[PDB]
Amino acid sequence: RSNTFGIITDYVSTTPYSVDIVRGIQDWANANGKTILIANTGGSSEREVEIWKMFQSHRIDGVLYVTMYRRIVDPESGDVSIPTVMINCRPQTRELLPSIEPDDYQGARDLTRYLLERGHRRIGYIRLNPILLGAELRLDAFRRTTSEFGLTENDLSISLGMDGPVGAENNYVFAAATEMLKQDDRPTAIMSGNDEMAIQIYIAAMALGLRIPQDVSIVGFDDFRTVTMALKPELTTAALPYYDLGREGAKWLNDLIAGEKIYPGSRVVSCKLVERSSAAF
Amino acid sequence: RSNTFGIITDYVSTTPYSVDIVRGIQDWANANGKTILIANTGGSSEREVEIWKMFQSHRIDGVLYVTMYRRIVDPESGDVSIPTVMINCRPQTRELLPSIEPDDYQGARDLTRYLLERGHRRIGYIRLNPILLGAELRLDAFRRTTSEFGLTENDLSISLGMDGPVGAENNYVFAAATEMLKQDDRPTAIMSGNDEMAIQIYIAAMALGLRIPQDVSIVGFDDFRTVTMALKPELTTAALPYYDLGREGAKWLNDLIAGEKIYPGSRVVSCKLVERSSAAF
């Protein structure tokens, strides 16, 4: 046993909004006497194969396969066999490896219900990049939760805010939010695909003389600290349990490495609704 | 030769605004046939010593010692000897190792001159965490550049925006910017310690009915993409050459590993002024 865990990640050099998983892994590692080595594939199957080979060569005890955003994918390990736990992603092949992911659907559901229980009936939703699985699941939740409550597609204002390659998108959130807020039947609440996008929606609203809670409520998603605590009023959002995913994933890998009869399958960790002050009745 | 470079970083799990250095290193590595393994010290001398030992054990060809923010520090490698190049930091011991850093002073100087050449005479500056070397150097530049031009301390509005442990500060940027903008002799331009802080200054200004370029110009620092392109108007700033620091640092390490008579000493890469539309005459 080298007591070294290897993390194979995909887009960490271009996606720094998921480092909290690493933070969770590292924190757990420091409390359990293990060292962590990180390798990035950049999304290349070729380089990934080579990385697995490298880890075998270095006698890594286990691997935490971590994706920057939620994905469904089978790792490309060639002929390498090392105990592995997937975090923030799920294998394409049923039960190929144990996995732990955040519940985008539940989070969006609870955030939508939050607004509904707060009197909002005309709700807007500006979509995160459609290529993202998480983006679509959050939208799926918004659509059904609002229908289950009674609102009709006619009470909603849904618009795309961006498209293109992740982390290099054609971004028009500000323009989309502006059009949405200038509508004759202006929504009273707007749900942002994620916290990052909320920055543009806050500016769009204020640029039209609207006061946040008072004139329009805004909620985000992720609890990306850099943003949520920068915006004023403080942004009410759904926190992706990244830190916990990392800590839980690491412990799980540790038990798997030590044997243990832990039925793999998939674990899904809930997203905590973080109530701040960007929404009003 | 393993053709593997190791990156020893400090606060990457809690500071994701410097991943671009890694992006630059990784990009160079992919174009030169090398693999990159990353290890984080979390700021612990103890864990760092152990990490150097680990790298020696794994036969890493060289190390890129990268700090999340600009620092002056001697690596704690114990008895380990491996070709090393420092990036975004400088050794405490004169010429202990080659190093390449961004020029915070030059960047702040050019950004201050930018405003001065644009008619501004009453300028505000909201300070980044004073514990940060970079924060102080940018302030040093603002102070002398404004004096060299002719303005007096009396024409400036300088205030702290935060303090405490980096990445866990007591943050009052919004409140400080609000007080500053409510002054009877309101500054016409405000320089933000960094781009992240600009989010709060934009909101502070708009919350008072002020229009950005029209009523008050705002410039930032870093060119933290997540922010600069989210704020509207687009934020004029000084770009920290992170990507280039990584690419240059990696090449430099490569030459050092291959021998080459490259006088170590320190290299300082300029910060590019990125003109957008958050400032007006």
- The DSSP code sequence of B154-177 is GGEEEEE-EESSTTS-EE-HHHHH
DSSP state of A218: E
Nearest residue to B180 via CA among B220, B135, B127, B228: B127
CA A197 to chain centre: 13
Assess contact for A116 and A278: CB atoms under 8 A. Answer: no
Rounded to whole angstroms, how far apart are CA atoms A96 and A259? 17
CA nearest to B54 within chain A = A35
Pairwise CB contact (< 8 Å): A200 & B230: yes
Helices (H), chain A: 19-31, 45-57, 104-116, 133-149, 173-181, 195-206, 212-215, 225-228, 242-257
What sign for the dihedral angle of Cα A255, A261, A264, A270? negative
- A contact residues 224-243, partner B, Cβ 8 Å cutoff: 226-227, 229-232
Q: How far are the Cα atoms of B18, B135, B139, B241 from residue B129, in angstroms, in the given order?
A: 17, 6, 11, 21
Question: Which chain A residues are closer than 8 Å to B50 by Cβ?
Answer: 35
**Which backbone phi and psi does B267 adopt, to 5 degrees?**
-115, 140
Contact between A139 and A125 under an 8 Å Cβ cutoff? The reply is yes
**B239 has which bridge partners?**
B222, B272
Whole-number Å distance between alpha carbons of B255 and B261 = 9
Count of CB contacts below 8 A, A vs B? 100
Run of H or E including A43: none
Return the structure tokens found at A167: 């982390």
H/E run at residue B40? strand B35-40
* Secondary structure of residue A190 in the 3-state scheme: strand
Contacts of B12 (CB under 8 A, 6+ apart): A19, A22, B18, B19, B22, B38, B40, B68
The residue with tokens 């219900």 is A113
Q: Does B36 lie at the interface with A, CB-CB under 8 angstroms?
A: yes
Contacts of residue B8, defined as CB under 8 A and 6 or more positions apart, other chains included, come to: B39, B41, B48, B51, B52, B55, B63, B64, B65, B66, B75
Q: How many beta carbons lie within 10 A of that of residue A94, not counting itself?
A: 8
Question: Quick check: A64 contacting B, CB < 8 Å?
Answer: no
CA A34 – CA A217 distance, rounded (Å): 45
Residue that the structure tokens 């916990």 belong to: A244
Q: How far apart are CA A42 and CA A56, in angstroms?
A: 20
Q: Which residues, in sequence order, are CB contacts of A104 under 8 Å at separation 6+?
A: A70, A133, A134, A137, A138, A141, A271
Mutate to test the interface with B, among A3, A7, A19 (most CBs of B within 10 A): A19
| A1-103+240-271: CATH number | 3.40.50.2300
Interface test with B, best of A166, A200, A226 (most B CBs within 10 A): A226
Q: How far is B18 from chain A (nearest CA, A)?
A: 9
Whether the CB of B207 is below 8 Å from some CB of chain A: the reply is yes
Residue B12 φ then ψ, to 5° = -65, -30
In three-state secondary structure terms, B109 is helix
Report the C-alpha gap between A38 and A63 in whole angstroms. Answer: 10
Best of B9, B13, B64, B278 to mutate (most A CBs within 10 Å, chain A): B13
Topology of the domain comprising A104-239+272-281: Rossmann fold (3.40.50)
Q: Does the beta carbon of B58 lie under 8 angstroms from any beta carbon of chain A? A: yes
Q: Which of A19, A204, A230 sits opposite B16 (nearest CB)?
A: A19
Q: What are the distances in angstroms from CA A129 to CA A40, A156, A168?
A: 22, 19, 11
Report the half-sphere exposure of A105 (CA within 13 A, side-chain side).
Answer: 6
Preceding omega of A233 cis (within 30 degrees of 0): yes
Distance, CA of A145 to CA of B62 (rounded, Å): 54
Spatial separation of the C-alpha atoms in residues A25 and A85, rounded to whole Å: 12
Q: Which helix (H) or strand (E) is B212 found in, with range?
A: helix B212-215
Is the distance from CB of B168 to CB of B194 less than 8 angstroms?
no
Q: What is the Cα–Cα distance from A217 to A233, expressed in whole angstroms? A: 10
* C-alpha pair distances (Å), A124 with each of A87, A213, B189: 31, 15, 35
Location of structure tokens 């004096």: B147
Which pair of structure tokens corresponds to residue B165? 């442990």
Residue in A closest to B207 by C-alpha: A206
Token pair, residue B81, equals 């000897």
**Spatial separation of the C-alpha atoms in residues B210 and B196, rounded to whole Å:** 20
Q: How many contiguous H segments (helices) and E segments (strands) does chain A have?
A: 9, 14
| Positive or negative: CA dihedral B271, B242, B73, B79 | negative
Query: CATH 3.40.50.2300: which residues of chain B?
Result: 1-103+240-271, 104-239+272-281
A138 min Cα distance to partner chain B (Å): 21
Do A277 and A234 form a contact (C-beta atoms < 8 A)?
A: yes
The CA distance from A250 to A73, in Å, is: 20
What is the side-by-side strand order in the sheet with B156-160?
B156-160, B123-127, B189-192, B217-219
**Residue A259 structure tokens:** 């044997």
Chain A residue numbers touching B54 (CB-CB < 8 A): 4, 35, 37
Two structure tokens written together for B61: 């060809």
Q: Resolution in A for the shown PDB structure?
A: 1.9
Burial of A260 (0-12, 13-18, 19+ CB in 10 A): exposed
Cα–Cα dist B102/A115, whole Å: 46
Tell if the CB–CB gap between B38 and A37 is shorter than 8 Å. yes
Q: Which residues pair with B160 in a beta bridge?
A: B127
Of A39, A50, A203, the CB nearest to B37: A39
Residues of B in contact with A173 (CB under 8 A): 230
Please count the other Cβ atoms lying within 10 Å of the Cβ belonging to residue A281: 10
Q: What is the CA radius of gyration of chain B?
A: 20
CB A85 within 8 A of CB A98: yes
Of B12, B23, B30, the CB nearest to A14: B23
C-alpha of A31 from chain center: 26
Inter-chain contact B229–A42, Cβ cutoff 8 Å? no
The residue among A118, A87, A70, A14 whose CA lies nearest residue A243 is: A87
Strand partners, A90: A72
Q: Using DSSP, state whether A72 is helix, strand or coil.
A: strand
Residues of A in contact with B12 (CB under 8 A): 19, 22
Q: How far is B67 from chain A (nearest CA, A)?
A: 15
